[PDB]
Scaffold this active site. Structure first.
Site, PDB file in Angstrom:
ATOM      1  N   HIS A 220       0.704  -1.109   0.058  1.00 35.97           N
ATOM      2  CA  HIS A 220       0.052   0.051   0.170  1.00 35.97           C
ATOM      3  C   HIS A 220       0.856   1.431  -0.222  1.00 35.97           C
ATOM      4  O   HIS A 220       0.698   1.918  -0.988  1.00 35.97           O
ATOM      5  CB  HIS A 220      -0.855   0.069   1.003  1.00 35.97           C
ATOM      6  CG  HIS A 220      -2.168   1.013   1.113  1.00 35.97           C
ATOM      7  ND1 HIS A 220      -2.339   1.680   0.175  1.00 35.97           N
ATOM      8  CD2 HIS A 220      -2.931   1.287   2.265  1.00 35.97           C
ATOM      9  CE1 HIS A 220      -3.483   2.282   0.392  1.00 35.97           C
ATOM     10  NE2 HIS A 220      -3.968   2.170   1.704  1.00 35.97           N
ATOM     11  N   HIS A 260      -2.733  -1.904 -11.190  1.00 37.20           N
ATOM     12  CA  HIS A 260      -3.837  -1.416  -9.958  1.00 37.20           C
ATOM     13  C   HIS A 260      -4.769  -2.406 -10.179  1.00 37.20           C
ATOM     14  O   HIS A 260      -5.287  -3.048 -11.248  1.00 37.20           O
ATOM     15  CB  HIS A 260      -4.156   0.023 -10.264  1.00 37.20           C
ATOM     16  CG  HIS A 260      -4.954   0.614  -9.221  1.00 37.20           C
ATOM     17  ND1 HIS A 260      -5.920   0.461  -8.827  1.00 37.20           N
ATOM     18  CD2 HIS A 260      -4.091   1.384  -8.370  1.00 37.20           C
ATOM     19  CE1 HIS A 260      -6.143   1.259  -7.991  1.00 37.20           C
ATOM     20  NE2 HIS A 260      -5.145   1.897  -7.306  1.00 37.20           N
ATOM     21  N   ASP A 315       1.726   6.423  -8.415  1.00 29.76           N
ATOM     22  CA  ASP A 315       3.042   6.244  -7.724  1.00 29.76           C
ATOM     23  C   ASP A 315       4.187   6.375  -8.860  1.00 29.76           C
ATOM     24  O   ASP A 315       5.564   6.345  -8.246  1.00 29.76           O
ATOM     25  CB  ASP A 315       3.351   5.342  -6.559  1.00 29.76           C
ATOM     26  CG  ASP A 315       2.040   5.536  -5.473  1.00 29.76           C
ATOM     27  OD1 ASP A 315       2.119   6.883  -5.069  1.00 29.76           O
ATOM     28  OD2 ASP A 315       1.496   4.578  -5.044  1.00 29.76           O
TER      29      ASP A 315
HETATM   30  O1  LIG Z   1      -6.860   2.270  -4.418  1.00 29.78           O
HETATM   31  C1  LIG Z   1      -6.140   1.649  -3.596  1.00 29.78           C
HETATM   32  O2  LIG Z   1      -6.420   0.271  -3.247  1.00 29.78           O
HETATM   33  C2  LIG Z   1      -4.748   1.954  -3.664  1.00 29.78           C
HETATM   34  C3  LIG Z   1      -4.774   3.328  -4.071  1.00 29.78           C
HETATM   35  O3  LIG Z   1      -4.469   3.647  -5.109  1.00 29.78           O
HETATM   36  C4  LIG Z   1      -5.085   4.473  -3.091  1.00 29.78           C
HETATM   37  O4  LIG Z   1      -5.383   4.185  -1.721  1.00 29.78           O
HETATM   38  O5  LIG Z   1      -4.937   5.628  -3.539  1.00 29.78           O
END
Ligand SMILES: O=C([O-])CC(=O)C(=O)O
Ligand SMILES: O=C([O-])CC(=O)C(=O)O
Lengths: 382, 380
Positions: A220, A260, A315
């Site tokens: 995460h 993702h 990221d």
């Molecule tokens: O959506 C997700 O599970 C991880 C992510 O990109 C965020 O928390 O911004």
């Protein structure tokens, strides 16, 4: 039932008005407003804070009052600062934030869930999060303690206190955009761990402490740092193709900042961060080179993985934006900057849960253990 | 689409560790019923071992195991200061959260690893005793103290907390309590810790997230709340009047009743009731509490039993801890809950990460505004 909901995939844990993600079209909206539209407009991060807590964008009058409430948070207790500074300097920035919020949670003995006070508590806490994150950065860098001062911009107050120098308009605007883009993302692991905590009617600060505990994990947190470390390995834009062959095609390493589990297309936050990273790195030769490596690697990665729904995520480029602002790679400071932004969404989700759909989260497990057996005296055990 | 409200009946993992039969009222740890465990005089360290290894230890295994746990009796000054710097009015379990969070930060070399997880967890069970002693000392305005090796984990804990030699009766009672709170499958605290460690965050951060959840009054605080309701009643002749005026009329919740899983008498409450009667019988002022509790209990079952609402473990545990010598203030009982439960939390975390790791990442149903154009603040 006997089926396991592995990873709670496609389990709906709540309803929300706050955020929608279209992982197939790559659209991220906050209360109906596209993040593209919000950034193009030049909206201050505080307007979007207000949107999360109030459910609509503020008037000029509402914003003025809102900013005052946030600014109350710039004053935090010495013991909260000491909860950071007493820790080893090698600790992850996000674990430092967690130690600080934990101390705050202990001390906030008069917190109570209440529709009349929740939003003001959350706003002041957004301010406290800036104060905490400044002091995490300072501790890590072996600098004296400092607090943010009131200004017309939350991004400005933050950067000036963090670095102890006057941030440029370009730096402030880029941080403003980063704060908006990380504001929320519906119910990721951090938001979820926080929801479990507040579902026992634990306090807001405990909810944040739990979110932090999740965000710390490398599935995460840690991704922007990992994307930067990968571009640093390549070192020279001319070597991207060779590196890609020697590391990715042969399966030695995973391509960082790609893929993702909701987006199966380019992450809209990444599309925005890319333009910002281009502009901010433009006149900084060393950072420019990291950008050039990133964009050349991106082409290779999309060509290899695009057809499988695996594209740059947020990221991939955020690191270059933070580096350009002036934050270092060490101690996963980028992940702390993620938590700085995300504390808005965490608290907006906690409030929405407890106020309007409260229920203790208490799942089950499928038992695959031993059948009933009788306790045998230790002296008789072989 | 459908919301799984409270994740009720959602299975988040498989486990070998603990089974709960909500209709029969049976609680087993790795196949052993808690009735059998306590009746057989098990050492809490035996049950810790059971959790972390999957079987009861041999004499040699237990000797080795106890040495590992005792490594945790030394914790750094900054961890003790994470507690002692807080306002004394802070909840005991929140002081524990601050101390474990400090620890999580410092533990920069932690890595999930089949070869080391159990030894890490063992030592952290020792550290939880050290932490809890210091939370108690801080709240009580006493000097810091660390636990020392003794004949038992429960003894090391009580002697350090109180700064006196605990009696055989007090040590056995604490030992029972530590066993009875060890684990309860996937309650909210364990669930929150699981979410955390599902990102591969470290064990200590998992414990931190579990403590965050335990703080809330729908999870922690019930043993304290039960004692407080008994103390309101004040005299046993006043039980029925208080019940009618507070509970039958819906003014107050009946504390220490009801459970998301048990739809019958909680087996832990059965065992705690016997101990609460025996220990309190020896101290008149506490015996009064017991007498009120058992009078109230009959009314509650009479009223709510048909609805599957019965005494749970927190109904009588407060009397046991108050007999042992712990006071009501600052929700110390909930810190005692955490002290015991840290074994189950860690055992679940290891089981999840080692054998069924998957990021926990649910979804939400969107009911917010439809797509709209951003409007400049000047024009609003
Ligand atoms: O959506 C997700 O599970 C991880 C992510 O990109 C965020 O928390 O911004
Ligand atoms: O099991 C639950 O849902 C709460 C409880 O009795 C525990 O955690 O022991």
């Amino acid at each position: 039932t006997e089926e396991i909901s592995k990873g709670l995939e496609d389990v709906n844990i709540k309803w929300t008005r706050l955020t929608t993600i279209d992982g197939n079209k790559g659209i991220l909206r906050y209360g109906g407003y596209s993040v593209e539209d919000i950034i193009a407009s030049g909206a201050q991060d505080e307007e979007i804070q207000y949107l999360f807590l109030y459910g609509n964008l503020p008037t000029e009058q509402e914003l003025r009052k809102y900013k005052e409430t946030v600014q109350k948070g710039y004053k935090i207790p010495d013991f909260v600062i000491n909860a950071i500074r007493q820790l080893p300097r090698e600790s992850d920035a996000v674990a430092m934030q967690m130690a600080a919020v934990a101390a705050m949670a202990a001390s906030e003995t008069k917190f109570k869930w209440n529709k009349d006070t929740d939003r003001d508590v959350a706003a002041e806490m957004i301010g406290r999060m800036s104060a905490i994150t400044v002091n995490v950065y300072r501790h890590i860098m072996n600098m004296p303690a400092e607090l943010p001062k009131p200004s017309d911009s939350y991004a400005e107050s933050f950067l000036n206190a963090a670095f102890g120098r006057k941030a440029t308009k370009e730096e402030i605007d880029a941080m403003n955009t980063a704060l908006i883009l990380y504001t929320d993302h519906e119910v990721p692991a951090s938001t979820t761990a926080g929801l479990v905590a507040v579902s026992t009617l634990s306090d807001m600060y405990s909810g944040i402490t739990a979110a932090l505990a999740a965000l710390k994990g490398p599935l995460h947190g840690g991704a922007a740092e990992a994307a930067i470390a990968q571009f640093d390995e390549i070192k020279d834009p001319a070597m991207v193709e060779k590196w890609f062959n020697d590391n990715i095609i042969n399966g030695k390493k995973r391509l960082m900042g790609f893929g993702h589990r909701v987006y199966k297309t380019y992450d809209p936050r990444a599309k925005i961060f890319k333009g910002i990273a281009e502009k901010l790195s433009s006149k900084k030769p060393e950072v420019h080179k990291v950008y050039e490596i990133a964009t050349k690697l991106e082409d290779f990665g999309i060509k290899a993985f695009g057809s499988k729904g695996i594209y740059p995520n947020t990221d991939y480029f955020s690191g270059i934006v933070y580096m350009s602002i002036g934050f270092p790679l060490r101690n996963n400071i980028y992940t702390a900057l993620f938590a700085l932004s995300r504390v808005t969404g965490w608290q907006a989700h906690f409030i929405e849960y407890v106020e309007e759909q409260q229920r203790l989260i208490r799942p089950r497990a499928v038992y695959v253990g031993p059948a009933e057996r009788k306790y045998v005296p230790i002296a008789e055990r072989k």
